[PDB]
Amino acid sequence: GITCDLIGNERLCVVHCLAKGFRGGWCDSRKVCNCRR
């Protein structure tokens, strides 16, 4: 599902975090979607 083509600029991932109710999300250096920030 959540994929990181962009790192950090990956709003398509960030929106998932925001949809869940997270402060936000970001793709880290591992190209993994993380939600918290």
> Tokens in use for 7?
């790192």
Q: Tokens 């109710």 appear where?
A: 21
CB atoms under 10 Å from CB of 34, counted, come to 16
Residue 34's Cβ-side half-sphere holds a number of Cα atoms within 13 Å equal to 11
Q: Residue 25 in contact with residue 8, Cβ under 8 Å? A: no
Ramachandran angles phi, psi of 33, nearest 5°: -75, 120
Distance CA 29, CA 19 (A): 23
CA 30 to chain centroid, in Å, comes to 12
Asked if CATH classification 3.30.30 holds for the domain at 1-37, the reply, yes or no, is yes
Q: How was this structure determined?
A: NMR
What three-state secondary structure class fits 23?
coil
